[PDB]
Design a protein around this ligand. Structure first.
Ligand SMILES: *C1O[C@H](CO)[C@@H](O)[C@H](O)[C@H]1NC(C)=O
Ligand SMILES: *[C@@H]1O[C@H](CO)[C@@H](O)[C@H](O)[C@H]1NC(C)=O
Ligand SMILES: *[C@@H]1O[C@H](CO)[C@@H](O)[C@H](O)[C@H]1NC(C)=O
Ligand SMILES: *[C@@H]1O[C@H](CO)[C@@H](O)[C@H](O)[C@H]1NC(C)=O
Ligand SMILES: *[C@@H]1O[C@H](CO)[C@@H](O)[C@H](O)[C@H]1NC(C)=O
Ligand SMILES: *[C@@H]1O[C@H](CO)[C@@H](O)[C@H](O)[C@H]1NC(C)=O
Ligand SMILES: *[C@@H]1O[C@H](CO)[C@@H](O)[C@H](O)[C@H]1NC(C)=O
Ligand SMILES: *[C@@H]1O[C@H](CO)[C@@H](O)[C@H](O)[C@H]1NC(C)=O
Ligand SMILES: *[C@@H]1O[C@H](CO)[C@@H](O)[C@H](O)[C@H]1NC(C)=O
Ligand SMILES: *[C@@H]1O[C@H](CO)[C@@H](O)[C@H](O)[C@H]1NC(C)=O
Ligand SMILES: *[C@@H]1O[C@H](CO)[C@@H](O)[C@H](O)[C@H]1NC(C)=O
Ligand SMILES: *[C@@H]1O[C@H](CO)[C@@H](O)[C@H](O)[C@H]1NC(C)=O
Ligand SMILES: *[C@@H]1O[C@H](CO)[C@@H](O)[C@H](O)[C@H]1NC(C)=O
Ligand SMILES: *[C@@H]1O[C@H](CO)[C@@H](O)[C@H](O)[C@H]1NC(C)=O
Ligand SMILES: *[C@@H]1O[C@H](CO)[C@@H](O)[C@H](O)[C@H]1NC(C)=O
Ligand SMILES: *[C@@H]1O[C@H](CO)[C@@H](O)[C@H](O)[C@H]1NC(C)=O
Lengths: 213, 178, 319, 231
């Protein structure tokens, strides 16, 4: 069976800059490849088939090259309508395998992530469980691993991630993490935190709260 | 000579096996020794046979060395002695085709008689042996009729025709009402 | 003494497994169906052409050709000769008719494994090759261009005919005189008092019922009914026999048991002119059929196609 | 035109079965080779199975051998793909792709046979959750007195426990275009959802003006006019 691999995974690309994507196979598959674009929450659409042949109604800035094992997707100029994900399919033999995926994003100055915390109300705790929100507003790059430190004891379970894509405002990100423990595991503890790791702001500055006023 | 019983208007499957699990050239001839089915290499052939198109074979099993002969919708004239000349070591098999019916609507009144007329091939003498939902066995030969037909006889009857330690169970419907 | 046996030969099995190996490297199907499981793959069209072959014994062995007029095909020969390789042969995969092969110098020669066995095919080798012209016309696309003052030069491409439909041609006169010659050799084999009749194929897979073959990377199927209908007493004088054919995508593999599907025809024209070197026949007797024998087209096993051209050869050890 | 039409959004509790549809708007049906493709949330494309144009043969990937059955309905010109024995991991989107329908009577391409996907279904999301239709439980979120961000703080409206999707969290049909971050929904440990629609405004919005996060949910017609209240 054929294994596909793209490069790079993440792509901090600027505007207008000429960029090239790769895809390597597990065996010689001739010139039978295809490149797909897919915008967020939308069906993928074919641009390049036959490894390099363009299709009717496809822009000219897109250029497919290569054969055998190594392949490349090149783009001359770059507009604001080409920031999607790209997949390599291999229409050689079944089973048809696809690519890993490469997110083409925008680049800007390394924005300082914003640490902020939301106080959970009692209509939220006196109903089922407890809520804790360490919201990060406007930062960069996307790669910013968050850690959770409640009661000093390192957290290793009940923490979920949830980010948003890049907006057409200032190309920034926003995330939010939460805990899934009730008022029983709440009264038993009093100290909290959420130290996020990132090169933009090294020092683990954190915002938290204590039981009551 | 093996034997197989087949029901008029039904599919049957004559079998034929060579030693090793390999696909080799076979054939099927009747009493007059006429081609019915063969195989040129890995293709299927046919013959001038009466069942020119009613024959077939599961080509998937040819690779395992089993060369069937599947006859479907068979009448009665066809019941003969079939030969499977495979690689010199030919094999024979006898085909018998029986069938039963009534010469009166199965929706009978209480007491009336019901005459089951059987269709036998010109060769062997069948051995009829009916059985109600109750189980009252009646033995015959060419025909088999039931005298008193009670009300608790309603349901389905199993008239099994035996011949040569092999049998083919039938299924007739009987409705008695008044 | 040196006994020959063309039917229990081993070059025939060797060549068979080699010729199959050629195909499975120079002719890939868009999807093959064998052993239940199914594989589909891209299938770039290619111009496959029957390319001559010499059978060559390995280091230490020799092949033996028997050069006797009217050879049994089996049984001790007298005027034998040694070789190293066989004269070039064309590996024609075809049914009902053997093509582009060697012929008899003298008269027609019918050979069989068992004449009385009606389940055994009858290899009929001709002494005079009949020519067949098969071709898919370029009838289909209707292009044209408007020429005039102020006229730009575009081309209007629209297809109007069946891009899969072809036909072959045969000399009516040649073929008739050919059949009447085979019937002569048959009467001098089963009896002069016997009557001869040719009749179409009984039934079965498409490849057998209809004279199939490969030409230009495409698979033909030719309704050879006009060919084998002749009752001795039945385009009468000097015309041109023409039979219907069709390119198919879905063919049943001859290599093993199964089906395969290939890409649609290619643009342009597809033409092959070949020699009818011989025909694969088959007989059918049913406990004495009054006093008349019928003969149908056979074929389907490619060992037969090989055997027709390896009947004089025998490989042996030179100890 | 010549598009492909897919069926709506499916909600299934584990252990059931669902059969998705896919009609071919134009062309000729026998020319289509409809293959089904799966895409799990936050994951890449994955092939599943398809039919063979002039065979009726349907082949599937080894992963989905005895679980999927792809059928073709000639009468209505629709293709179906049923999925048996539903678990939680099969939550995904199922597109029906297909190489352009070239007329059977047409000279062969250079690819021989086109196994690339030209046409794509709009998308059919299939979520496997145990829970049934629940109303979006809205909760308040007030600003903090000890703010050290940059003068500007942040309020919000933490919508928790709802099902199914979607659920638009607009503010007065457009209260502000800056700082509004309507995060995506996530499945809790159970079978519900939880997003966090927040926004950043000047610290001078105590009582001069405050926005309301009007939360809707047409599938259960639940509405909420929760007014944001500071502290
Ligand atoms: C040959 O002659 C017979 C009549 O004697 C006729 O029925 C048959 O159709 C003719 N040709 C064949 C063998 O089909
Ligand atoms: C040709 O050889 C065969 C095989 O032995 C044998 O039947 C006979 O010698 C010849 N043919 C005839 C006329 O029977
Ligand atoms: C070989 O066989 C033929 C049989 O017809 C015989 O006539 C001929 O003399 C032989 N060859 C020679 C030249 O010895
Ligand atoms: C075809 O047959 C003719 C004799 O009619 C022969 O001269 C020619 O070489 C043959 N063509 C080939 C090479 O098969
Ligand atoms: C073909 O064989 C016959 C004898 O069967 C012979 O008379 C003839 O000369 C050969 N070829 C031709 C047509 O010259
Ligand atoms: C030739 O074929 C007949 C078919 O009836 C068979 O009976 C006979 O045994 C065969 N002869 C030989 C060579 O054994
Ligand atoms: C058939 O084709 C050949 C080769 O193209 C040509 O020489 C001949 O005139 C054509 N006519 C016949 C005899 O079929
Ligand atoms: C195409 O031309 C051939 C002769 O070259 C003819 O036999 C056939 O009928 C034609 N097909 C049509 C009508 O397009
Ligand atoms: C075959 O023969 C017919 C005779 O009318 C002729 O019209 C046709 O063009 C021939 N086919 C070819 C070109 O081989
Ligand atoms: C065969 O067909 C051609 C037309 O393609 C015709 O001109 C020729 O006379 C025919 N050949 C003969 C005489 O058999
Ligand atoms: C035909 O020849 C055979 C030779 O065995 C003979 O017995 C028979 O009487 C002949 N039939 C006719 C038509 O007289
Ligand atoms: C061959 O000839 C007979 C003559 O009676 C005919 O009935 C039969 O259909 C033909 N067989 C084939 C191959 O269809
Ligand atoms: C070719 O074969 C089919 C068999 O069904 C027959 O119906 C048709 O008439 C034949 N065509 C010819 C060559 O006349
Ligand atoms: C076949 O012969 C008949 C009888 O004259 C004739 O009508 C027809 O033109 C010939 N077919 C062709 C054109 O080959
Ligand atoms: C038969 O041989 C000739 C000459 O080599 C070749 O041109 C033709 O294509 C061959 N026919 C077949 C069966 O492909
Ligand atoms: C075939 O059988 C019939 C039986 O009535 C017989 O009269 C006839 O002469 C036979 N055919 C011939 C001419 O051999």
């Amino acid at each position: 069976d054929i294994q596909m691999t793209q490069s790079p995974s993440t792509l901090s690309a600027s505007v207008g800059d000429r960029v090239t994507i790769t895809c390597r196979a597990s065996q010689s598959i001739s010139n039978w490849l295809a490149w797909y674009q897919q915008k967020p929450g939308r069906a993928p659409k074919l641009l390049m088939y036959k490894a390099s042949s363009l299709k009717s109604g496809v822009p000219s800035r897109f250029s497919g090259s290569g054969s055998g094992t190594e392949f490349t997707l090149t783009i001359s100029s770059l507009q604001s309508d080409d920031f999607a994900t790209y997949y390599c399919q291999q229409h050689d033999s079944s089973p048809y395998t696809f690519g890993q995926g490469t997110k083409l994003e925008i680049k800007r100055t390394v924005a300082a992530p914003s640490v902020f915390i939301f106080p959970p109300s009692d209509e939220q705790l006196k109903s089922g469980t407890a809520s804790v929100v360490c919201l990060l507003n406007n930062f960069y790059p996307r790669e910013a691993k968050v850690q959770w430190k409640v009661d000093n004891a390192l957290q290793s379970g009940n923490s979920q991630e949830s980010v948003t894509e890049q907006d057409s405002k200032d190309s920034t990100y926003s995330l939010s993490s939460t805990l899934t423990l009730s008022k029983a595991d709440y009264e038993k503890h009093k100290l909290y935190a959420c130290e996020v790791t990132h090169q933009g702001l090294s020092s683990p500055v954190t915002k938290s709260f204590n039981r009551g006023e | 000579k093996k034997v197989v019983l087949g029901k008029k208007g039904d599919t049957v499957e004559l079998t034929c096996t060579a030693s090793q699990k390999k696909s080799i050239q076979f054939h099927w001839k009747n009493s007059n020794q006429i081609k019915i089915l063969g195989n040129q290499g890995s293709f299927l052939t046919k013959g001038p046979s009466k069942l020119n198109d009613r024959a077939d074979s599961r080509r998937s099993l040819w690779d395992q060395g089993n060369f069937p002969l599947i006859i479907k919708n068979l009448k009665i004239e066809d019941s003969d002695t079939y030969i499977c000349e495979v690689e010199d070591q030919k094999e024979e098999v006898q085909l018998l085709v029986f069938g039963l019916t009534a010469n009166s609507d199965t929706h009978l009144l209480q007491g009336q008689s019901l005459t089951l007329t059987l269709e036998s091939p010109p060769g062997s003498s069948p051995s009829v042996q009916c059985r109600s939902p109750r189980g009252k066995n009646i033995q015959g030969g060419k025909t088999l009729s039931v005298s008193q037909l009670e009300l608790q006889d309603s349901g389905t009857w199993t008239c099994t025709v035996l011949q040569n330690q092999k049998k083919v169970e039938f299924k007739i419907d009987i409705v008695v009402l008044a | 003494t040196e006994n020959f046996n063309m039917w229990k030969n081993n070059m025939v099995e060797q060549m068979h497994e080699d010729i199959i190996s050629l195909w499975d490297q120079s002719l890939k199907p868009c999807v093959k169906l064998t052993g239940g499981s199914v594989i589909t793959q891209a299938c770039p069209k290619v111009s496959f052409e029957p390319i001559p072959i010499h059978y060559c014994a390995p280091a230490g062995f020799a092949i033996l050709k028997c050069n006797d007029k009217k050879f049994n095909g089996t049984g001790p020969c007298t005027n034998v000769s040694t070789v190293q390789c066989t004269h070039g042969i064309r590996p024609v995969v075809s049914t009902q008719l053997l093509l582009n092969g060697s012929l008899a110098e003298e008269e027609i020669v019918i050979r069989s494994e068992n004449f009385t066995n009606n389940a055994k095919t009858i290899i009929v080798q001709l002494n005079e090759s009949v020519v067949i012209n098969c071709t898919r016309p370029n009838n289909n696309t209707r292009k044209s261009i408007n020429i005039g003052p102020g006229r730009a030069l575009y081309t209007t491409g629209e297809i109007i005919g069946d891009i899969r439909q072809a036909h072959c041609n045969l000399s009516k006169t040649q073929w008739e005189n050919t059949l009447e010659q085979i019937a002569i050799k048959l009467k001098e084999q089963f009896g002069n008092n016997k009557t001869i009749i040719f009749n179409p194929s009984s039934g079965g897979d498409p490849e057998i019922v209809t004279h199939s073959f490969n030409c230009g990377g495409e698979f033909f199927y030719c309704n050879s009914t006009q060919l084998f209908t002749w009752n001795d007493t039945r385009n009468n004088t000097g015309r041109n026999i023409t039979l219907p054919c069709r390119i198919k995508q879905i063919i049943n593999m001859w290599q093993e048991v199964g089906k395969a599907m290939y890409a649609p025809p290619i643009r342009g024209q597809i033409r092959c002119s070949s020699n009818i070197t011989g025909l694969l026949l088959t007989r059918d007797g049913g406990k004495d059929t009054n006093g008349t024998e019928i003969f149908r087209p056979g074929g389907g096993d490619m060992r037969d196609n090989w055997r027709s051209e390896l009947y004089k050869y025998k490989v042996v050890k030179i100890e | 035109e010549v598009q492909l039409v897919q069926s709506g959004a499916e909600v299934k509790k584990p252990g059931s079965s669902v059969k998705v549809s896919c009609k071919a708007s134009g062309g000729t049906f026998s020319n289509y080779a409809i293959n089904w493709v799966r895409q799990a949330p936050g994951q890449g494309l994955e092939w599943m199975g398809g039919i063979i144009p002039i065979f009726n043969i349907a082949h599937y990937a080894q992963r989905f051998q005895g679980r999927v059955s792809i059928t073709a309905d000639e009468s209505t010109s629709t293709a179906y793909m049923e999925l048996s024995s539903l678990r939680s991991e099969d939550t995904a989107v199922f597109y029906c792709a297909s190489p352009y329908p070239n007329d059977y009577n047409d000279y062969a391409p250079e690819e021989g046979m086109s196994w690339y996907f030209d046409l794509w279904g709009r998308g059919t999301l299939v979520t496997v959750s145990p829970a049934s239709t629940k109303g979006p439980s809205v909760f308040p979120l007030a600003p903090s007195s000890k703010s050290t961000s940059g003068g500007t703080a942040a309020l919000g409206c933490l919508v928790k426990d709802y099902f199914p999707e979607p659920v638009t969290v607009s503010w007065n049909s457009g209260a502000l275009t800056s700082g509004v971050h309507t995060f995506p929904a996530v499945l809790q440990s159970s079978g519900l959802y939880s997003l966090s629609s927040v926004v950043t405004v000047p610290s001078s919005s105590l009582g001069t003006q405050t926005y309301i996060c009007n939360v809707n949910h047409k599938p259960s017609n639940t509405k909420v006019d929760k007014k944001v209240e500071p502290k």
